[PDB]
Amino acid sequence: IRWTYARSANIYPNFRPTPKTSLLGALFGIGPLFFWYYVFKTDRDKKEKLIQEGKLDQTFNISY
Amino acid sequence: STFVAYLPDYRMQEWARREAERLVKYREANGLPLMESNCFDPNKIQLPEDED
Amino acid sequence: NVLQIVRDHWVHILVPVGFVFGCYLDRRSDEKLTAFRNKSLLFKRELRPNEEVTWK
Amino acid sequence: MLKIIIPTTMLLPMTWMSKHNMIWINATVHSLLISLISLSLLNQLGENSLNFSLTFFSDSLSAPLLVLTTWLLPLMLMASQSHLSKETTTRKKLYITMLILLQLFLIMTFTATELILFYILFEATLVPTLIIITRWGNQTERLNAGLYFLFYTLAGSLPLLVALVYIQNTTGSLNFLIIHYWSHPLSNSWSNIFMWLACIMAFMVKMPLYGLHLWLPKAHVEAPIAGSMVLAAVLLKLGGYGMMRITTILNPLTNYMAYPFLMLSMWGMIMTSSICLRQTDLKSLIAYSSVSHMALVIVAIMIQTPWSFMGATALMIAHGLTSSMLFCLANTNYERVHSRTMILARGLQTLLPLMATWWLVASLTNLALPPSINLIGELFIITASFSWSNITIILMGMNMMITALYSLYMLITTQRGKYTHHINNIKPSFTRENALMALHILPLLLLTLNPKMILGPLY
Amino acid sequence: MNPFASLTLTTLTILTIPIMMSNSNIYKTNLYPNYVKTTVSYAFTLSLVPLLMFMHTGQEMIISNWHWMTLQTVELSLSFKMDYFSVMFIPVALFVTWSIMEFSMWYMHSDPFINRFFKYLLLFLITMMILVTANNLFQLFIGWEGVGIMSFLLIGWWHGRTDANTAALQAILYNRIGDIGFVLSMAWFLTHSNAWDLQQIFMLNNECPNMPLIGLLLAAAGKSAQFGLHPWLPSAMEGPTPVSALLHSSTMVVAGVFLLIRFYPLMETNKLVQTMTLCLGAITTLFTALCAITQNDIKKIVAFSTSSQLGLMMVTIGINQPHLAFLHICMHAFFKAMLFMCSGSIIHSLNDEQDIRKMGGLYKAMPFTTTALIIGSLALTGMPYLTGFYSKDLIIEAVNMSYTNAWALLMTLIATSLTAAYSTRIIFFAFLGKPRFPPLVLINENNPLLINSIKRLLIGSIFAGFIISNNIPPMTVPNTTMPLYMKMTALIVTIMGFMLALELNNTTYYLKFKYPSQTYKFSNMLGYYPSIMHRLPTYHNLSMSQKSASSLLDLIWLETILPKTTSFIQMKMSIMVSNQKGLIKLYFLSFLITIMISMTLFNYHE
Amino acid sequence: PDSWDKDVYPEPPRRTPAPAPQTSLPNPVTYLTKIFDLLVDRPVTLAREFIEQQHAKNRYYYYHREFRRVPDITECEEKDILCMFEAEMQWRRDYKVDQEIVNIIQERLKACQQREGESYRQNCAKELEQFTQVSKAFQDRYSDLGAHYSARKCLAKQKQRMLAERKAAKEAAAA
Amino acid sequence: AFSAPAAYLTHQQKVLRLYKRALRHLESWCVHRDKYRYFACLMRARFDEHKNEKDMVKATQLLRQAEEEFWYGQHPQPYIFPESPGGTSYERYECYKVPEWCLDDWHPSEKAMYPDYFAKREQWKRLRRESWEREVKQLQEETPPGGPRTEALPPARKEGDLPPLWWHIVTRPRERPM
Numbered sequence A: 001i002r003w004t005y006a007r008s009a010n011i012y013p014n015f016r017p018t019p020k021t022s023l024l025g026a027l028f029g030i031g032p033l034f035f036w037y038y039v040f041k042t043d044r045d046k047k048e049k050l051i052q053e054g055k056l057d058q059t060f061n062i063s064y
Numbered sequence B: 001s002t003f004v005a006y007l008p009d010y011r012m013q014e015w016a017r018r019e020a021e022r023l024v025k026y027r028e029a030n031g032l033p034l035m036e037s038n039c040f041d042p043n044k045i046q047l048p049e050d051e052d
Numbered sequence C: 001n002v003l004q005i006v007r008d009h010w011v012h013i014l015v016p017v018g019f020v021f022g023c024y025l026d027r028r029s030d031e032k033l034t035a036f037r038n039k040s041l042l043f044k045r046e047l048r049p050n051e052e053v054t055w056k
Numbered sequence D: 001m002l003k004i005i006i007p008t009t010m011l012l013p014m015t016w017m018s019k020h021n022m023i024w025i026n027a028t029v030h031s032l033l034i035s036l037i038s039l040s041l042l043n044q045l046g047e048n049s050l051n052f053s054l055t056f057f058s059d060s061l062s063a064p065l066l067v068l069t070t071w072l073l074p075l076m077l078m079a080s081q082s083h084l085s086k087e088t089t090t091r092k093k094l095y096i097t098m099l100i101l102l103q104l105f106l107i108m109t110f111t112a113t114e115l116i117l118f119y120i121l122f123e124a125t126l127v128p129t130l131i132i133i134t135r136w137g138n139q140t141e142r143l144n145a146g147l148y149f150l151f152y153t154l155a156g157s158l159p160l161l162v163a164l165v166y167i168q169n170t171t172g173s174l175n176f177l178i179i180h181y182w183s184h185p186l187s188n189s190w191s192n193i194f195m196w197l198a199c200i201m202a203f204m205v206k207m208p209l210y211g212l213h214l215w216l217p218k219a220h221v222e223a224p225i226a227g228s229m230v231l232a233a234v235l236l237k238l239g240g241y242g243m244m245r246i247t248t249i250l251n252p253l254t255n256y257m258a259y260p261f262l263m264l265s266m267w268g269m270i271m272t273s274s275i276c277l278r279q280t281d282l283k284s285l286i287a288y289s290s291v292s293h294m295a296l297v298i299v300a301i302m303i304q305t306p307w308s309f310m311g312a313t314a315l316m317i318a319h320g321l322t323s324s325m326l327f328c329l330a331n332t333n334y335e336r337v338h339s340r341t342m343i344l345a346r347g348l349q350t351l352l353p354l355m356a357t358w359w360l361v362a363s364l365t366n367l368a369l370p371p372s373i374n375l376i377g378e379l380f381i382i383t384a385s386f387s388w389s390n391i392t393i394i395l396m397g398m399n400m401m402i403t404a405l406y407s408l409y410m411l412i413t414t415q416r417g418k419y420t421h422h423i424n425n426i427k428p429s430f431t432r433e434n435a436l437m438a439l440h441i442l443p444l445l446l447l448t449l450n451p452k453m454i455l456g457p458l459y
Numbered sequence E: 001m002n003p004f005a006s007l008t009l010t011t012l013t014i015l016t017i018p019i020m021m022s023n024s025n026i027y028k029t030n031l032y033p034n035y036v037k038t039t040v041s042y043a044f045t046l047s048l049v050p051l052l053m054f055m056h057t058g059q060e061m062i063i064s065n066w067h068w069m070t071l072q073t074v075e076l077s078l079s080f081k082m083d084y085f086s087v088m089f090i091p092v093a094l095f096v097t098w099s100i101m102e103f104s105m106w107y108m109h110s111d112p113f114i115n116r117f118f119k120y121l122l123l124f125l126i127t128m129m130i131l132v133t134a135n136n137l138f139q140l141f142i143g144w145e146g147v148g149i150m151s152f153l154l155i156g157w158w159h160g161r162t163d164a165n166t167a168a169l170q171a172i173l174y175n176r177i178g179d180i181g182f183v184l185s186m187a188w189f190l191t192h193s194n195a196w197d198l199q200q201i202f203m204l205n206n207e208c209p210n211m212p213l214i215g216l217l218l219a220a221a222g223k224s225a226q227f228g229l230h231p232w233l234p235s236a237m238e239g240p241t242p243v244s245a246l247l248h249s250s251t252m253v254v255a256g257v258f259l260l261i262r263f264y265p266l267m268e269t270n271k272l273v274q275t276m277t278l279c280l281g282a283i284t285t286l287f288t289a290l291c292a293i294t295q296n297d298i299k300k301i302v303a304f305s306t307s308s309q310l311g312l313m314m315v316t317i318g319i320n321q322p323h324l325a326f327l328h329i330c331m332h333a334f335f336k337a338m339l340f341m342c343s344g345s346i347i348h349s350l351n352d353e354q355d356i357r358k359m360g361g362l363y364k365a366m367p368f369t370t371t372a373l374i375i376g377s378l379a380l381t382g383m384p385y386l387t388g389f390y391s392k393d394l395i396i397e398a399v400n401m402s403y404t405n406a407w408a409l410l411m412t413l414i415a416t417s418l419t420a421a422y423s424t425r426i427i428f429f430a431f432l433g434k435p436r437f438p439p440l441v442l443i444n445e446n447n448p449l450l451i452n453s454i455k456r457l458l459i460g461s462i463f464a465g466f467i468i469s470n471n472i473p474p475m476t477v478p479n480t481t482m483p484l485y486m487k488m489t490a491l492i493v494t495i496m497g498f499m500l501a502l503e504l505n506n507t508t509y510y511l512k513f514k515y516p517s518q519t520y521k522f523s524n525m526l527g528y529y530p531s532i533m534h535r536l537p538t539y540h541n542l543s544m545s546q547k548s549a550s551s552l553l554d555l556i557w558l559e560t561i562l563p564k565t566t567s568f569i570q571m572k573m574s575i576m577v578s579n580q581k582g583l584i585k586l587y588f589l590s591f592l593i594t595i596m597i598s599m600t601l602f603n604y605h606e
Numbered sequence F: 001p002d003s004w005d006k007d008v009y010p011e012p013p014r015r016t017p018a019p020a021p022q023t024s025l026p027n028p029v030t031y032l033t034k035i036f037d038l039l040v041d042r043p044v045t046l047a048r049e050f051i052e053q054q055h056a057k058n059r060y061y062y063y064h065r066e067f068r069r070v071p072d073i074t075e076c077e078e079k080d081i082l083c084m085f086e087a088e089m090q091w092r093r094d095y096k097v098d099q100e101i102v103n104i105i106q107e108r109l110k111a112c113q114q115r116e117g118e119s120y121r122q123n124c125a126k127e128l129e130q131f132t133q134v135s136k137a138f139q140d141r142y143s144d145l146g147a148h149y150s151a152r153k154c155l156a157k158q159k160q161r162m163l164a165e166r167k168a169a170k171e172a173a174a175a
Numbered sequence G: 001a002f003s004a005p006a007a008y009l010t011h012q013q014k015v016l017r018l019y020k021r022a023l024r025h026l027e028s029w030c031v032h033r034d035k036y037r038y039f040a041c042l043m044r045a046r047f048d049e050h051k052n053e054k055d056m057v058k059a060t061q062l063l064r065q066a067e068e069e070f071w072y073g074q075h076p077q078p079y080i081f082p083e084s085p086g087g088t089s090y091e092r093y094e095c096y097k098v099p100e101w102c103l104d105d106w107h108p109s110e111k112a113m114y115p116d117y118f119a120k121r122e123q124w125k126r127l128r129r130e131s132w133e134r135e136v137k138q139l140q141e142e143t144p145p146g147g148p149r150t151e152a153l154p155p156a157r158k159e160g161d162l163p164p165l166w167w168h169i170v171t172r173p174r175e176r177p178m
């Protein structure tokens, strides 16, 4: 019971906003979101401006 | 489950298949294109007259 | 014999009766939306020699 | 739609005028009968929805959701009557009344023709759920859970109310047919951006979107078994249904307003699946799994393709059945040993073999084994996402792996190994529990034979 | 109507009948295993007929019997491809399963759930038939995941043993990684070729790009346990020996290779993926062979032999010899299943002992097992005019005479020597010398089930190569002209392996002791791949899953930002608003302030 | 058989050779074929004969539904909801029929690839070209509409394409 | 497995355990019986060389460097008995071990079969119920005030007493329970 309580309910009462806690939170929280936004936005911009050029090999691509 | 298995074809897929069969027969019996890139008649469209 | 068993099982008519009443009210609701009955360009038809309405 | 609705209402006085020892029998019988009658909404025209009247209509999107609701009610009654045995007659009737009112609100919400009525019923579902959680919840933590469930939901839904009345002032109607036929593009302006957000955030918090999901572990874990069943099977799907309806007035803005929600949903898919790997509570694990599945549904709705909408419908239905089954399975063991900790009872396959079979089948549908409809939905969504961008496969691929991992982890931890020596009160499985599991599972398997029924309007 | 379709479908249909009878009275009796065995033997003898039809006229067919669902422009149907691969692999798999079920009736006699075990074996066979005969990718995925789950359930048979549960989950994990690539291939093929069936995919892909082929390669690497995803096959030796004999040695393991063979028309149009397939295969065969020669558990040695032969199948797919690769799959099934059954008879006779260091002189004590294992070892090493010879000697000949990566060729030859060496180790250690097992001798191989099953696979391992090779049309332009040294390369390499392994084994009788070489420690601990890759990624993933995802984000920061901030702010504002002292002087003074403000910042503004 | 139209589902004249035995050995395939015939194909045929005898006694038919041609979305004015409704239903039915046309062409392509064996790359070129033409047309009409598609969006797509084509032809005429 | 452990191992116990481990790993290296027998006698001799050392410090350093040698020269894959904690049959039959209390949940129709077994089981249950209180009292008698110090349990000492805490030791399932 002590183990499960410490692993779930006792965690927030013992939290302090610290340089380490804040920096780790920002990193592991919003870093990946912006990484993936950059990746997907870049890929889709490439693909769209490639379609505008008439250059993508879209034959047979009826289903989407 | 039986009732759902024997539900009548209200989604009209058999009808659609027979309709496509009629259309394909008529269209390659006459040498016409199987499908036209225009869904609607271009004679019923009135584009804006000047483009520049 | 049937008096008290009716008095203790009469609740088994409520939901079937509600079902029947709901079917009736659905038909009455249909009876209010007949403004285009046999009037659509796709299904407008000539009545048979004896029929009165194309759907009820 | 009246034929389905009146009998459901009838269920109310039928249970209030029943003898003290016949409430469960009566409610179960007539709930099953109502479910059978509802089964007749699956006949769909094709080109358009069935419009019964000005107020109600049924769709191919709608028909599967209604059948699932009506089918879930008798299962909730079977699951409840065990832990409610000590309760007084009046309080048992009140509990059943809560469940009936919830079913009634849900049926109406799915079939309402216009948004204001949809909003009112979609919000009315909050009261019975809150009462169930806070009055019949086992733990002290239920009160906090109730507050979290209420406030997260209202903070999203009130801007939706403002947006809806504004939209009817500018357009003249909120009827869904008129809304669809007279649709016009949304310009790219700050006003339209905030209208988009106010139209979307309520359904986002209902799903829940990752980061706005904290209410769900609380509420789903602290609720009684029937509360958890209806919260996971049906109430999460209100967000998906509402989003699928509302995104018709939002084009072409969705093209770029969807980016942050897609990022959140994909990364949080990975996040909640990883969280399931280190969970000490067994209900907590099933809740987070639900979150991971609904993230997939959010992606499918945001990318706005026919294949993604089909996959979203199939996944909503399949998740509703599987998640309810998993909650019931966990509750049986909880009833035995009175603790939610996953490592407390081990090696249960040695003591309860048929329940171990139910566990295996539920775990296999949770990881989307072919050709179950869970995999049908997931595969359709993954294909649509691939078309949207080929890099989504990496995230989708990773999620599939982590899901298999935690599903089989739960199975192995609870069923395999050796039994805890000290616990000696694990009695044989009751017929009620086995029948409850079968009535969850048989419908899912049956659905594989006829996939189109749960596919939706796009099909 | 033509018989060919009816018989090919009945072959798979009758296999489901003992599963339907699972809830019946027969299951509760002791007659169920014999019943399942008899059903499988009847299925084999029935599948023999379509094979004759194909071998006579080359008959092939596809059957789209049931329409499942249609999504706008895509139609999904239950369809079966009954080409050369299906009609040749079905009787082989049924024959091996028949032998292994007759063997199981003896090996698993005291198991209290032998009926369930037989049911499980049958379930695997059905899903493998589904995998092999599938005509579209969805049905093939069904068979794929089905054999995956049956593997999971059969590896963790003894579910009270923790290592069995670990090995079962490991198989699932490695397979999932492979599945990722399978799903990638499916998605590409639908959004580009607008179909999932083989016919449309072949028509519309005359120049197949890299992405779908690399997906298929990832899937095959996962399913066939290649060097990235190899460790699950040796650890799957946790299952009962019949499971190892059928599922992990001769049937389920070749699915990845079979997937690459099903798509060879697309792979012959891409040299990059061919190079990748060849290189992956070459490293895998050499590495597995290297790990095998220092193992002391007999099942581990045979499992590493299986991994090495799968690598060889992948290299022969890489040199654009799909038909040749398929032939090896059929040839290797016979003698590798027989090798596993021989190891099982040994293990059962020696009181469930698997370490070869406690197996002494069995060459005389177990004469029939010895004969069978010697013949299987000679077939594995490519002895002339044997089943192994047609399949492996042709593969070495084709790898020698093609425009191929030089490192891959060298690794293939070294692995061909390694094969001879490990085979030598098993025979020398297990059958020669003096007894090293406990003194209560329970050795007894006089059971007709064991003898009959092993004799059946023995006749197979002796004659099937010749018969099959002479009864099929030639799909390969044969290598007729090569230098004599090149021709004898497989033989020269094999004899070298024989001699050197036998020398280094004879030197262990000497009364001299030295500590182990670092190369030995590398070979024995499997290159330290499971020591590192099973601890570092797992630790880091589980640690981040608790510390960052669960605690730092859910329990702390997502709590802090939205709900806790709201509570704190409203609590502060409530305390500020409601804590008035109740003095009218103070309230009235504020009223004056309010009145002044309104008549200035509101009354001056109109 | 005659049940389906052989013009929509064509197949070549089905040339098969005659058996030319070269050995005294008996062919086990033909003996197995006689056995199969007289054990399987005759009882099945008799059962079917009885079933169709019972079918002929009670013969009833169903009729394919025919739909008039109503005005399309181009000749509906902007806020007329009834014309818009009928035009949208007609457009949806046409979309369904076009999906089925593409399905028929794909069935032809698949049947050809299977039938032609090792010679499919040359012997199925007409089927491939036919599919290419149909696929191009279907793609122009419905691709990128998205879910929530409609006749108005299909019309807007067509008009955008027509504008681009007209402007391209006009600047080609100045060349 | 059966004996209560002690707070620590003596130097002598450590030395004997290292002797056994070295012998087993040497047997793993020396497969054949004669060669192992030779090198095991050489091992015993090298072990006896320092048998009668009186300086505890140097004996400890000998043990330490011997352990270092064993670790560098151990077999990476030593032989394990099949049912030992690393064996291939270690926990193979744990899925067949069912606790005896499950027999009380059997249906009366199941207990109709096997009447004699269940009569004798009722006798055993009577015995346990009538011994429990004496067991508890005896354990309270023989135990120091500051709680027990080791995991050792006393035997029975009176006429019809049973050794305290015997039920779950006597009623083990079996080691081949099916």
Ligand SMILES: CCCCCCCCCCCCCCCCC[C@@H](O)O[C@H](CO[C@H](O)CCCCCCCCCCCCCCC)COP(=O)(O)OCC[N+](C)(C)C
Binding pocket: B001, B002, B004, B005, B006, D039, D064, D065, D067, D068, D071, D317, D443, D446, D447, D449, D450, D454, E019, E020, E021, E022, E023
């Ligand atoms: C434990 C013992 C096990 C061993 C015993 C096993 C016994 C055999 C089991 C295997 C049986 C296999 C049967 C395979 C299916 C054959 C029939 C199948 O084809 O019917 C399907 C149809 O299945 C039904 O559609 C299933 C409908 C779903 C049932 C729902 C039940 C009621 C609802 C319950 C609550 C649901 C909650 C969720 C709602 C969304 C598809 O039919 P279809 O190919 O077209 O038919 C063509 C000809 N028709 C159309 C004229 C008939």
Ligand SMILES: CCCCCCCCCCCCCCCCC[C@@H](O)O[C@H](CO[C@H](O)CCCCCCCCCCCCCCC)COP(=O)(O)OCC[N+](C)(C)C
Binding pocket: D188, D189, D190, D193, D210, D211, D212, D257, D260, D261
């Ligand atoms: C934890 C989970 C919470 C739920 C997630 C909610 C997600 C909400 C995020 C909304 C998505 C984007 C919002 C608006 C789209 C673009 C935003 C803006 O940055 O883009 C540029 C806008 O330029 C500048 O960036 C102006 C905006 C900068 C001021 C906003 C402050 C952002 C700081 C982040 C605060 C976090 C907000 C969420 C609170 C929790 C585009 O340049 P421009 O073409 O000129 O403007 C387009 C609009 N026009 C056409 C009318 C002119």
Ligand SMILES: CCCCCCCC/C=C/CCCCCCCC(=O)OC[C@H](COP(=O)(O)OCCN)OC(=O)CCCCCCC/C=C/CCCCCCCC
Binding pocket: D397, D398, D401, D405, E163, E166, E167, E169, E170, E173, E177, E180, E217, E218, E221, E226, E227, E228, E229, E235, E280, E530, E533, E534, E535, E537, E538, E541, E542
């Ligand atoms: C491509 C997408 C995926 C790529 C892989 C990303 C990293 C995957 C990390 C997985 C994290 C899972 C954490 C939880 C796992 C459960 C715990 C667990 O399994 O414990 C480890 C368990 C026990 O160890 P044993 O040695 O078997 O024990 C025997 C003695 N008792 O073993 C395992 O299952 C660990 C498996 C981890 C695999 C990670 C390494 C795989 C790397 C593959 C890269 C190469 C790909 C192949 C390329 C092929 C060519 C195209």
Ligand SMILES: CCCCCCCC/C=C\CCCCCCCC(=O)O[C@H](COC(=O)CCCCCCC/C=C/CCCCCCCC)COP(=O)(O)OCCN
Binding pocket: D151, D152, D153, D154, D155, D156, D159, D162, D163, D166, D190, D191, D192, D194, D195, D197, D198, D199, D201, D205, D212
């Ligand atoms: C459980 C947590 C959920 C939180 C959800 C909060 C976000 C909800 C979405 C935004 C809420 C307010 C939107 C307003 C409702 C739409 C009405 C509308 O569209 O009218 C706009 C008006 O737009 C506005 O005025 C909106 C301005 C914002 C005022 C309130 C700010 C509250 C915070 C805004 C950012 C938060 C929204 C996203 C947060 C998501 C949750 C984390 C245009 O009308 P006109 O005035 O006539 O302009 C054209 C004619 N001149």
